[PDB]
Amino acid sequence: QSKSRKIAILGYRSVGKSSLTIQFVEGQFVDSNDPTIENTFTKLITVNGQEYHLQLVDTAGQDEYSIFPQTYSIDINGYILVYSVTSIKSFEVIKVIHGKLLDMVGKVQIPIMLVGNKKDLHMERVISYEEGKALAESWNAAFLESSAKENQTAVDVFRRIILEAEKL
Ligand SMILES: Nc1nc2c(ncn2[C@@H]2O[C@H](COP(=O)(O)OP(=O)(O)O)[C@@H](O)[C@H]2O)c(=O)[nH]1
């Protein structure tokens, strides 16, 4: 029988939070200039034979000054933290967000996924794979690079966070 899990997707503006989520949920790459507002999707996924009902919370992009909420610091089963490999600023910001997140969750190990998105834009990449891998390692977080244009990598992101959560 199925299990329910709630995942929050966090990160700086225009890193691809919406696009990655929509690619996973709907199978389509959408290019939109609407600002990302908090949006919750529901999605079925099977991971190692276990069926999951996912609630995916896309959050508005935040920056270093962003006060971290409290609503995103309880009842979440796992967090996907997204930066863009084409944006140094998004990478600086994801460190600040992670720090504020750990401060809010208290004395518990919470599944965290670091995601470097937009890996298809080879001519604009300014962050190496190794920089993100090393960051995730210092965090004990899973790490993947992704492209919202590539369905397999979006699926792999959301499978991975469920893999991490099930380890407890
Ligand atoms: N080439 C490419 N463009 C992307 C990718 N992800 C997002 N984008 C584009 O980047 C812009 C911001 O993406 P969006 O999903 O709205 O970012 P959000 O603010 O984090 O939700 C939009 O133009 C997207 O079409 C990606 O993986 N590859």
Residue numbers in the entry: 3 to 170
From the paper:
Mammalian target of rapamycin complex 1 (mTORC1) serves as a central regulator of cell growth and proliferation by integrating signals from growth factors, nutrients, energy status, and cellular stress. A small GTPase, called Ras homolog enriched in brain (Rheb), is a positive regulator of mTORC1. Like other small GTPases, the function of Rheb is dictated by its guanine nucleotide binding states: it is active in the GTP-bound form and inactive in the GDP-bound form. The Y35N mutant assumes a very similar overall structure as the WT Rheb with a typical small GTPase protein fold composed of a six-stranded β-sheet surrounded by four α-helices.
Surprisingly, the Y35N mutant, which was initially identified in several human cancers (Lawrence et al., 2014), could significantly increase the phosphorylation level of mTORC1 substrate S6K1 compared to the wild-type (WT) Rheb, and thus is regarded as a constitutively active mutant (Grabiner et al., 2014; Heard et al., 2014). To investigate the molecular basis for the constitutive activation of mTORC1 by the Y35N mutant, we determined the crystal structures of Y35NGppNHp and Y35NGDP at 2.0 Å and 2.1 Å resolution, respectively. On the other hand, the overall structure of Y35NGDP is more similar to that of WTGppNHp (RMSD of 0.79 Å for 162 Cα atoms) than that of WTGDP (RMSD of 0.92 Å for 162 Cα atoms) or Y35AGDP (RMSD of 0.97 Å for 167 Cα atoms). In the Y35NGDP structure, no Mg2+ could be identified at the active site, although Mg2+ is present in the protein storage buffer and the crystallization solution. In contrast, the switch I region and the binding mode of GDP exhibit notable difference in Y35NGDP and WTGDP (RMSD of 2.2 Å for 9 Cα atoms of the switch I region using the least-squares fitting method). Similarly, in Y35AGDP, the switch I region adopts a similar conformation as that in WTGDP, suggesting that mutation Y35A does not affect the conformation of switch I. However, in Y35NGDP, the side chain of Asn35 flips away from the nucleotide and points toward the solvent (about 180° rotation from that of Asn35 in Y35NGppNHp). Meanwhile, the side chain of Thr38 extends slightly closer toward the nucleotide, and thus occupies in part the position of Mg2+ and forms a hydrogen bond with the β-phosphate of GDP. In the Y35NGDP structure, the switch I region assumes a similar conformation as WTGppNHp and Y35NGppNHp and, in particular, the side chain of Thr38 is oriented toward the nucleotide to avoid steric conflict with mTOR, and hence both Pro37 and Ile39 are in proper positions to make tight interactions with mTOR. In other words, Y35NGDP mimics WTGppNHP in binding to mTOR and thus is capable to activate mTORC1 in a similar way as WTGppNHp.
